Amino acid sequence: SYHLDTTAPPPTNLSTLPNNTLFHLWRPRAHILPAEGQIGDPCAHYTDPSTGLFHVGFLHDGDGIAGATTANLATYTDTSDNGSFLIQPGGKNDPVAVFDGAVIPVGVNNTPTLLYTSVSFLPIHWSIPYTRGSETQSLAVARDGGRRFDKLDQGPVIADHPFAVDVTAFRAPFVFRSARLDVLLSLDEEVARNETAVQQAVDGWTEKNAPWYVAVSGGVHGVGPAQFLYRQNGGNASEFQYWEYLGEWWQEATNSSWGDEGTWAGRWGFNFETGNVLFLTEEGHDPQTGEVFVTLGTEGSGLPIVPQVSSIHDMLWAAGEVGVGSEQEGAKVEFSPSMAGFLDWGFSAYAAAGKVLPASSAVSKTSGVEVDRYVSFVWLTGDQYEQADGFPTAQQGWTGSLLLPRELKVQTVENVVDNELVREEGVSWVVGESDNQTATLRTLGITIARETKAALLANGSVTAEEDRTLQTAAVVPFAQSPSSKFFVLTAQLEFPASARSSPLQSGFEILASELERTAIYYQFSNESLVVDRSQTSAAAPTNPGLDSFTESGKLRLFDVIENGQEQVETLDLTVVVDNAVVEVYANGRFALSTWARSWYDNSTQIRFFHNGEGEVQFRNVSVSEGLYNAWPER
Numbered sequence: 001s002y003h004l005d006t007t008a009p010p011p012t013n014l015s016t017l018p019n020n021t022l023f024h025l026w027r028p029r030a031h032i033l034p035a036e037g038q039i040g041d042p043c044a045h046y047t048d049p050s051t052g053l054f055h056v057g058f059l060h061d062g063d064g065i066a067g068a069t070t071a072n073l074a075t076y077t078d079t080s081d082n083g084s085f086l087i088q089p090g091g092k093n094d095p096v097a098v099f100d101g102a103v104i105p106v107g108v109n110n111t112p113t114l115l116y117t118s119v120s121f122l123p124i125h126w127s128i129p130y131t132r133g134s135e136t137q138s139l140a141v142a143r144d145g146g147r148r149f150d151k152l153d154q155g156p157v158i159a160d161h162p163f164a165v166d167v168t169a170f171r172a173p174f175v176f177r178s179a180r181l182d183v184l185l186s187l188d189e190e191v192a193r194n195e196t197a198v199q200q201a202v203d204g205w206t207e208k209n210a211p212w213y214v215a216v217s218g219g220v221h222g223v224g225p226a227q228f229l230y231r232q233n234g235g236n237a238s239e240f241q242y243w244e245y246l247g248e249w250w251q252e253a254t255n256s257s258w259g260d261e262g263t264w265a266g267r268w269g270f271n272f273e274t275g276n277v278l279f280l281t282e283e284g285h286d287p288q289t290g291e292v293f294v295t296l297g298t299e300g301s302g303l304p305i306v307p308q309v310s311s312i313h314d315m316l317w318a319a320g321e322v323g324v325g326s327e328q329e330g331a332k333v334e335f336s337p338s339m340a341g342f343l344d345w346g347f348s349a350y351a352a353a354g355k356v357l358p359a360s361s362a363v364s365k366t367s368g369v370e371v372d373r374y375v376s377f378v379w380l381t382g383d384q385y386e387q388a389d390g391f392p393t394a395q396q397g398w399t400g401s402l403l404l405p406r407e408l409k410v411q412t413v414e415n416v417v418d419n420e421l422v423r424e425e426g427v428s429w430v431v432g433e434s435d436n437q438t439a440t441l442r443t444l445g446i447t448i449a450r451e452t453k454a455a456l457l458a459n460g461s462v463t464a465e466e467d468r469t470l471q472t473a474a475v476v477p478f479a480q481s482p483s484s485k486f487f488v489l490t491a492q493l494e495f496p497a498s499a500r501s502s503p504l505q506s507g508f509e510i511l512a513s514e515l516e517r518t519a520i521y522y523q524f525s526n527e528s529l530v531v532d533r534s535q536t537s538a539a540a541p542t543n544p545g546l547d548s549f550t551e552s553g554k555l556r557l558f559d560v561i562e563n564g565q566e567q568v569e570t571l572d573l574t575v576v577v578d579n580a581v582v583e584v585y586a587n588g589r590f591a592l593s594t595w596a597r598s599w600y601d602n603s604t605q606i607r608f609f610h611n612g613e614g615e616v617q618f619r620n621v622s623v624s625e626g627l628y629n630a631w632p633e634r
């Protein structure tokens with residue numbers, strides 16, 4: 001009889017253990033995930049007009065959308081027991097399955113209304129023929145406080161994909177409002193060609209009565225990934241039955257990519273998934289003044305292609321402009337990217353679903369936020385999108401988790417030396433201004449929702465480390481490491497301009513003991529933050545299900561003028577470890593998340609790391625231990 005003892009070597013085959021034996025071993029305490037079982041794409045979030053509460057949704061066990069609510073964005077309550085499902089398959093419109101959907105706060109009967117993909121046939125994949133009628137978009141209305149969504153007793157409101165278009169996918173509807181879209185669609189084909197006339201109309205746009213837009217994510221066979229745009233018919237904010245097709249407002253060539261190298265924004269792949277239409281400002285989210293941003297997952301593959309398998313799942317984002325529908329019979333409106341990147345560089349991070357969080361929300365009132373925010377929840381698949389090599393699933397009793405809620409806004413990088421590092425082609429930023437001597441850059445800002453970050457540091461024990469400099473290769477253990485796998489690690493690493501050309505690697509080793517360690521370091525060679533998981537788990541060698549491949553993401557440190565002086569921009573790191581869930585944040589404009597399934601309880605040492613190449617200076621290194629409980633009621 002083998003009882004779990006994590007002070008002793010792991011059994012050779014974890015999959016032989018009894019059910020639920022590994023339930024708590026790698027489970028997080030401050031993240032969003034169901035009480036048990038598997039979690040898929042997060043979805044149906046919305047602020048309830050009546051209560052001001054923020055509702056969170058997510059696919060659960062491949063059997064529908066489950067939910068939970070929060071009043072503070074730090075802590076959550078399940079909407080119900082027995083899975084806490086809001087809506088499940090089996091209706092006339094979704095006999096086979098219920099996929100992602102989005103909510104209009106004041107919809108039918110003036111109640112929260114969910115527009116979702118009702119599935120009638122399987123399988124569905126961009127690499128095989130699409131079965132007509134596979135995915136339609138249906139409506140359901142929130143009842144009993146939103147603890148459940150009742151499907152309207154009629155067929156889908158969008159019963160078919162675009163006429164005669166051979167789509168690769170037609171799902172994940174996302175609703176939004178837009179001053180610019182309303183203006184571009186109201187003005188003349190000629191009167192709307194000039195920003196002057198438009199801007200004047202946008203200034204008068206009134207959100208409260210604007211019509212809703214719907215972006216359905218997908219692609220076209222033999223053509224390319226794309227987003228299909230619709231809007232309440234005739235621009236009638238009161239029309240919920242008929243949705244006029246505005247065309248493929250955004251499409252890219254099959255497996256093409258941002259830039260000529262596919263260096264900063266992966267590839268557009270073969271199919272677009274779970275779109276979000278954001279409107280960001282430097283302070284938050286404004287559908288009247290915000291710049292158009294889009295986050296989406298793209299499904300890619302190497303060659304030869306393996307039918308029904310998407311080998312690459314990129315969690316991307318793009319920003320650009322929207323204009324009138326060229327002159328061709330193309331979309332009435334068109335989104336043109338100016339810059340693009342990754343919302344999260346994690347292999348397993350994917351299907352981001354966010355929502356506008358009004359300053360009028362109970363969450364914001366309580367925390368005192370006076371602007372509208374856009375909160376995004378990234379999915380962290382637990383079994384490499386079901387391609388894991390026999391992960392001990394029955395033993396764990398659950399699969400997957402969502403990452404920490406993140407605030408998305410326009411982030412600026414000031415006092416940046418305008419040089420090659422800034423003018424490169426196909427990057428994740430644009431120059432907002434310049435005098436040819438220094439410039440302000442504009443990119444997507446990615447930060448942990450402020451109430452969540454505060455909650456993480458609420459009751460945490462704080463242990464600081466003295467500023468340090470390393471020149472020769474070295475691994476220096478902290479003066480005091482945490483005694484648990486729940487902590488927030490912060491640190492600033494300063495590099496000399498002479499390091500850009502060096503094969504320098506500097507960072508930390510975490511979750512470490514004699515037989516285990518996880519490395520996190522910056523690498524100038526390819527300007528990337530890297531998470532070496534080759535030694536993360538003592539159990540990985542004999543259990544291939546526990547992926548141990550290296551994770552990395554691109555992060556360029558710009559030459560800037562800090563105190564009237566030039567220097568390589570400081571690497572501002574924040575690593576959050578809710579157990580096996582590791583999230584690496586950098587300079588408010590980067591995120592890389594992965595699983596670090598360390599085995600031993602002793603594996604909690606933290607060390608400074610330097611490979612002797614180049615030089616590094618560590619400043620303001622600190623550790624907050626304990627985090628907090630995201631689900632008190634459980």
Ligand SMILES: OC[C@H]1O[C@@](CO)(OC[C@@]2(O[C@H]3O[C@H](CO)[C@@H](O)[C@H](O)[C@H]3O)O[C@H](CO)[C@@H](O)[C@@H]2O)[C@@H](O)[C@@H]1O
Binds near residue numbers: 171384
């Ligand atoms: O689960 C539905 C929901 O998932 C999204 C975001 O991940 O893409 C899903 C997709 O893959 C899932 O299902 C395949 C098996 O079909 C499984 O191998 C994979 O691991 C799962 O993530 O589901 C459809 C088909 O069932 C595939 O085309 C797609 O790759 C989102 O787009 C969808 O609403």
